[PDB]
Design a protein around this ligand. Structure first.
Ligand SMILES: Nc1nc2c(ncn2[C@@H]2O[C@H](COP(=O)(O)OP(=O)(O)O)[C@@H](O)[C@H]2O)c(=O)[nH]1
Ligand SMILES: [Mg+2]
Length: 164
């Protein structure tokens, strides 16, 4: 089962990463997510096809109580932060804890540093993100939904982990 849940503070880029993968497009305008939405996409990898189910969650504190149910049901948790926002990175500990609380070790977690295109506003180094992922035993990658940088690789890697 290939069910991915996207977690992270508001404005880090969860929706944009999903949209970039789904339709290979990006919108600079912000469109806050309401509740939890579901999207599906079949992708290719390792001589086969995999049906991915994506669950985009809203970071607003008022939708918080609806997330645990989705996390429990997901085989992959993509925890996203904004490389230019220190708070968003610090908050990944909250999200990862929520995931572990629901799935323990029976889950694939990918920590994502998004918005790498905003290099002149970077607050978290790539090494700091890599080390945080290593210490928490989760996977790591940096992306830019805006340019598309590493977005397909993000999904390729999580799907590969699932097939393994
Ligand atoms: N520069 C830049 N902006 C981004 C990137 N990803 C998302 N954004 C912008 O950041 C804002 C929030 O994006 P959104 O996908 O709604 O984030 P979400 O709240 O986590 O779902 C929007 O204005 C996006 O256009 C990125 O990689 N680079
Ligand atoms: Mg969103």
């Amino acid at each position: 089962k290939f069910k991915l849940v996207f977690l992270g503070e508001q404005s880090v880029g969860k929706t944009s990463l999903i949209t970039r993968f789904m339709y290979d497009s990006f919108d600079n305008t912000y469109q806050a997510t309401i509740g939890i939405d579901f999207l599906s996409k079949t992708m290719y990898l390792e001589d086969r096809t995999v049906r991915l189910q994506l669950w985009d969650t809203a970071g607003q504190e008022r939708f918080r109580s609806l997330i645990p149910s989705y996390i429990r049901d997901s085989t992959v948790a993509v925890v996203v932060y904004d490389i230019t926002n220190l708070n968003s990175f610090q908050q990944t500990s909250k999200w990862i804890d929520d995931v572990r609380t629901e799935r323990g070790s029976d889950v694939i977690i990918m920590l994502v540093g998004n918005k790498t295109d905003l290099a002149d506003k970077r607050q978290i180094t790539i090494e700091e993100g890599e080390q945080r992922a290593k210490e928490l035993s989760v996977m790591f990658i940096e992306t830019s939904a805006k340019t598309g940088y590493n977005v397909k690789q993000l999904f390729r890697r999580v799907a590969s982990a699932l097939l393994e």
